[PDB]
Amino acid sequence: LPPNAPACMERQLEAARYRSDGALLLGASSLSGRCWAGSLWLFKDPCAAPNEGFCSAGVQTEAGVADLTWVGERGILVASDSGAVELWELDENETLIVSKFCKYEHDDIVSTVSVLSSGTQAVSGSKDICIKVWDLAQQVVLSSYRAHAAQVTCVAASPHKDSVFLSCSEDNRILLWDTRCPKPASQIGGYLPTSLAWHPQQSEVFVFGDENGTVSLVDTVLSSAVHSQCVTGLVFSPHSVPFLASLSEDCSLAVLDSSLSELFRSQAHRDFVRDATWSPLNHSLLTTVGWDHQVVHHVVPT
Amino acid sequence: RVSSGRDLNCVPEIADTLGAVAKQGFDFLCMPVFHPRFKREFIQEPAKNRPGPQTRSDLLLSGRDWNTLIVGKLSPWIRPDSKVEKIRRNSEAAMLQELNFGAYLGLPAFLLPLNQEDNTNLARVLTNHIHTGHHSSMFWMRVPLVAPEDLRDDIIENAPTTHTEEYSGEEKTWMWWHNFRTLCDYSKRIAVALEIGADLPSNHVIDRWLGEPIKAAILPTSIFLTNKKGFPVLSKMHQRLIFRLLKLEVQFIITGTNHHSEKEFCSYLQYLEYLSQNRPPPNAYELFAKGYEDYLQSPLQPLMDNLESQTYEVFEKDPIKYSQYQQAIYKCLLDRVPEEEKDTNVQVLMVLGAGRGPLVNASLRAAKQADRRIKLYAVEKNPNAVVTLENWQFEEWGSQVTVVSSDMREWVAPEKADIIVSELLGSFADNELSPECLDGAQHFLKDDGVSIPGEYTSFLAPISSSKLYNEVRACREKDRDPEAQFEMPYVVRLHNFHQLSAPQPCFTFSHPNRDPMIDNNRYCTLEFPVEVNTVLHGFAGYFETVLYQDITLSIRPETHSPGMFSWFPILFPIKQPITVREGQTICVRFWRCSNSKKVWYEWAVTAPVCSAIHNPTGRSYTIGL
Numbered sequence: 001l002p003p004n005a006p007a008c009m010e011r012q013l014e015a016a017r018y019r020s021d022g023a024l025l026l027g028a029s030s031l032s033g034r035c036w037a038g039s040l041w042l043f044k045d046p047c048a049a050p051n052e053g054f055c056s057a058g059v060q061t062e063a064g065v066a067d068l069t070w071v072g073e074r075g076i077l078v079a080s081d082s083g084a085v086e087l088w089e090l091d092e093n094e095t096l097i098v099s100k101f102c103k104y105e106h107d108d109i110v111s112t113v114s115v116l117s118s119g120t121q122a123v124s125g126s127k128d129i130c131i132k133v134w135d136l137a138q139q140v141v142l143s144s145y146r147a148h149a150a151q152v153t154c155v156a157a158s159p160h161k162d163s164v165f166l167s168c169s170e171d172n173r174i175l176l177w178d179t180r181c182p183k184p185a186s187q188i189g190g191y192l193p194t195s196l197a198w199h200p201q202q203s204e205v206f207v208f209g210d211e212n213g214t215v216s217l218v219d220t221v222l223s224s225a226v227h228s229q230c231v232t233g234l235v236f237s238p239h240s241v242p243f244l245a246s247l248s249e250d251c252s253l254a255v256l257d258s259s260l261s262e263l264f265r266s267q268a269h270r271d272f273v274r275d276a277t278w279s280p281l282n283h284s285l286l287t288t289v290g291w292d293h294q295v296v297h298h299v300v301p302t
Numbered sequence: 303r304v305s306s307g308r309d310l311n312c313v314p315e316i317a318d319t320l321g322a323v324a325k326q327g328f329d330f331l332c333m334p335v336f337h338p339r340f341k342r343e344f345i346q347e348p349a350k351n352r353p354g355p356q357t358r359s360d361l362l363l364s365g366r367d368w369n370t371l372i373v374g375k376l377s378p379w380i381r382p383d384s385k386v387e388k389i390r391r392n393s394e395a396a397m398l399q400e401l402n403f404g405a406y407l408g409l410p411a412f413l414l415p416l417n418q419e420d421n422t423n424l425a426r427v428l429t430n431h432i433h434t435g436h437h438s439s440m441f442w443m444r445v446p447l448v449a450p451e452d453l454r455d456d457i458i459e460n461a462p463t464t465h466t467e468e469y470s471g472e473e474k475t476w477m478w479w480h481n482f483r484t485l486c487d488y489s490k491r492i493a494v495a496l497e498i499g500a501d502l503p504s505n506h507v508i509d510r511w512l513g514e515p516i517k518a519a520i521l522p523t524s525i526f527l528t529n530k531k532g533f534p535v536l537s538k539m540h541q542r543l544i545f546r547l548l549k550l551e552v553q554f555i556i557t558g559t560n561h562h563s564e565k566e567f568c569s570y571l572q573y574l575e576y577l578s579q580n581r582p583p584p585n586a587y588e589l590f591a592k593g594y595e596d597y598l599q600s601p602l603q604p605l606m607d608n609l610e611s612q613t614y615e616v617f618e619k620d621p622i623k624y625s626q627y628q629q630a631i632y633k634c635l636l637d638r639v640p641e642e643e644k645d646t647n648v649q650v651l652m653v654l655g656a657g658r659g660p661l662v663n664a665s666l667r668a669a670k671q672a673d674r675r676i677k678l679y680a681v682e683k684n685p686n687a688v689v690t691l692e693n694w695q696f697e698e699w700g701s702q703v704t705v706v707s708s709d710m711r712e713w714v715a716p717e718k719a720d721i722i723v724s725e726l727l728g729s730f731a732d733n734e735l736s737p738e739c740l741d742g743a744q745h746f747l748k749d750d751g752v753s754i755p756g757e758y759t760s761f762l763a764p765i766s767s768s769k770l771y772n773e774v775r776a777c778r779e780k781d782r783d784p785e786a787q788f789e790m791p792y793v794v795r796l797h798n799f800h801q802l803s804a805p806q807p808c809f810t811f812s813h814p815n816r817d818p819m820i821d822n823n824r825y826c827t828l829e830f831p832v833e834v835n836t837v838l839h840g841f842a843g844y845f846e847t848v849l850y851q852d853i854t855l856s857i858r859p860e861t862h863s864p865g866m867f868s869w870f871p872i873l874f875p876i877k878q879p880i881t882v883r884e885g886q887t888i889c890v891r892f893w894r895c896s897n898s899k900k901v902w903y904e905w906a907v908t909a910p911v912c913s914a915i916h917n918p919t920g921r922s923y924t925i926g927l
């Protein structure tokens with residue numbers, strides 16, 4: 001029950017991400033009822049989540065949390081229902097989450113957000129069809145790009161190339177971006193693409209999921225029908241030879257190997273599975289959250 | 303006084319949001335009635351069993367507020383035409399769910415997107431909803447001037463943007479709308495919310511929406527410029543479009559976030575007010591005609607029917623018209639009576655159809671100003687108006703005026719006229735049977751006598767107006783041909799419409815008709831060049847008339863007598879809209895038909911396709927002799 005921390009956390013858990021030391025960041029939305037807001041939470045003990053009385057820190061946001069991501073070790077970057085991109089920061093004590101900036105640059109819900117290589121810039125995509133590149137220190141938009149023709153479902157920063165990132169959209173495009181290029185987007189060659197994950201060990205390799213449950217491995221093709229509904233997210237594990245976690249509106253989590261073959265399946269969740277994040281400390285532990293308000297800690301066989 | 307609404311996709315608390323919106327000056331608020339990211343499952347366990355509540359409570363607003371302040375929005379994840387079968391099924395169930403909640407709440411309108419070409423299944427679900435209880439609620443289809451695909455930045459190195467003109471391609475979104483409303487069978491509950499982008503298309507793309515049921519125009523805050531002082535404004539071209547839309551009294555909707563953060567947010571709205579205040583007020587005519595816009599009227603038949611007191615009052619409230627008549631009579635008196643004869647030569651003037659007296663007084667004022675002598679007969683077959691005339695005669699005119707209560711075709715005149723004056727014209731000139739009446743009066747015109755008017759000509763012009771087509775369609779009546787409403791003309795102040803080619807003359811009549819073989823039937827073929835893609839719904843009709851020499855009356859637009867209120871246009875509909883491409887010719891055929899009891903019109907399109915012959919044998923519409 002730490003200070004300026006809401007007594008109750010909202011039902012619809014949207015995001016879960018570990019940082020280096022293993023504190024767990026949670027993002028929640030109230031997607032029904034009287035108030036449609038959101039909140040941010042840090043659990044230095046992840047096994048206490050999502051119980052509010054045993055969190056390290058928490059804070060209410062004005063609108064729901066469609067997406068978030070760590071910025072470094074103390075920064076939290078939030079895609080808001082309000083069209084805002086928000087940056088919050090932990091205090092030196094890590095007992096308060098404090099708004100750093102809240103800029104209303106999109107004209108619709110901000111759906112996806114991703115920190116670029118350097119840690120000093122981020123990209124956001126929105127239902128307004130735009131993608132924006134942000135300078136986090138100057139709290140300003142550096143570029144706004146209207147490449148797509150429909151909502152921007154996902155953006156993912158390149159792991160090591162600070163000018164390279166992916167995006168996909170309901171206009172059925174997957175775009176590879178390199179802002180060193182005069183025309184910065186390129187169309188990579190179906191069912192609508194819904195999620196993106198760069199390979200952490202291979203520069204030019206990524207995986208994407210679609211609205212029909214298929215996961216695909218792509219070089220700058222291999223695929224498997226993993227899910228019976230939309231593929232909401234894709235998270236490579238931290239292992240030298242990584243595993244690939246995939247999550248779906250079908251309420252399951254799958255874990256896949258190098259060839260997209262299934263090694264693990266969980267049906268613990270009773271509603272949509274919304275995020276998955278691998279422990280830095282124990283590499284076989286994988287944590288999910290979903291709209292059923294569960295935080296599940298899977299032990300993945302390796 | 304612009305009526306304006308705020309579009310939001312994020313409402314943390316209804317009460318607080320509604321207050322903020324009202325304080326900023328808006329009249330209404332378009333918002334989601336379910337959370338826009340709250341995707342719901344209807345078929346597959348376990349997600350289909352998600353504990354409720356499925357949304358916010360109806361108790362959060364009063365019934366009056368749901369009914370008047372809230373426009374609902376279809377959730378953006380609902381995709382009834384998805385290529386994924388499961389998504390199509392969930393979407394249909396979710397679409398019915400949200401639409402039924404809207405009807406549950408009594409919301410006055412509900413917004414649905416047309417953001418792609420194929421909306422077949424969305425139209426089917428909407429049409430199903432519409433046939434599930436009779437309700438007055440409106441469905442606003444949110445459709446852009448310019449498809450997003452056609453305005454995207456040219457930043458995709460391996461998919462450049464088109465740089466060549468695609469005339470019909472740039473009209474694609476009109477096609478999205480037209481197919482959708484055709485599928486939904488021109489439901490009156492389905493209207494357009496036209497969304498305006500930062501860059502406007504060619505004029506022809508904009509003009510495609512002429513005559514469509516535009517209920518709302520959506521202005522994103524991103525299309526506004528910034529003036530020296532920092533305030534949002536619009537480019538002169540957008541201002542042009544706004545003015546055009548104010549003439550249709552659409553509702554304006556402000557969408558997007560505030561990008562002029564130095565200024566507050568009523569700013570976008572104050573600018574709209576500023577534009578509304580800056581335009582020419584009601585110039586006498588438009589003051590008079592605003593209430594009548596697109597209001598269908600039965601054409602008067604003053605021959606067969608006895609006009610009411612207040613109908614004559616409408617005629618008489620047009621001084622420019624009668625002073626045209628005065629000038630025609632004046633010039634004629636002078637041409638007929640030399641100065642040396644001004645005291646010996648009394649001219650016999652007959653007003654044929656005098657109503658309540660205005661031509662009688664115009665004749666008297668004309669004689670005074672001409673300094674000539676006239677003997678007046680006031681002929682009127684309507685005995686109720688004859689009451690007005692005989693009180694005038696006893697009280698004012700005296701013996702100089704003889705009131706004759708008689709049909710001009712039966713009256714045995716005691717002498718012959720030097721001038722017969724008449725106002726027997728309808729909006730289509732001869733559609734009150736002015737030719738037949740003057741023919742039957744002719745025998746008592748002197749051999750060298752003058753008829754005022756001396757001639758008239760009707761005019762036709764093809765038009766597009768899905769709004770007017772739907773209004774005619776709604777005129778089905780219980781105990782007649784279910785299509786008779788399309789086989790009859792209407793007097794209407796045409797307003798939301800597109801004229802497709804310049805008016806061309808149709809039928810002409812001259813009086814006196816010296817000709818020994820009088821035939822008032824007519825058969826005319828017209829060819830209208832059309833330089834746009836469009837849809838034909840009917841023909842506007844107007845007329846011109848020569849009262850005397852260069853003194854005329856006209857409601858044909860390019861020669862409209864300035865300042866004259868009398869006579870709105872007439873409209874001939876056709877039963878079935880006809881598609882017309884750029885560069886095609888519209889060929890129409892009009893007949894004036896008669897027997898001894900009735901006169902009527904028949905009409906038919908014969909290019910680019912044939913219609914049925916409309917009103918064959920007068921079966922739907924006749925004018926009584």
Ligand SMILES: Cn1ncc(-c2ccc3c(=O)[nH]nc(C[NH3+])c3c2)c1-c1c(F)cc2ccccc2c1C#N
Pocket residue numbers: 594599600601602604613616617618620725726727728729734793868869870871
């Ligand atoms: C429906 N209709 N058909 C014919 C006419 C009409 C209007 C004006 C006039 C007119 O000066 N003069 N003469 C005639 C007929 N000879 C006449 C006829 C009308 C009519 C009417 F009977 C009443 C109205 C009331 C308010 C606004 C417009 C009209 C209109 C119109 N147009």
Ligand SMILES: CSC[C@H]1O[C@@H](n2cnc3c(N)ncnc32)[C@H](O)[C@@H]1O
Pocket residue numbers: 604605608609617654655656657658681682683684687708709710711725726739
């Ligand atoms: C100004 S509308 C036409 C006027 O002339 C009258 N009128 C029309 N036809 C005749 C007719 N054949 N004989 C006499 N009056 C007529 C009508 O009753 C109306 O008052």
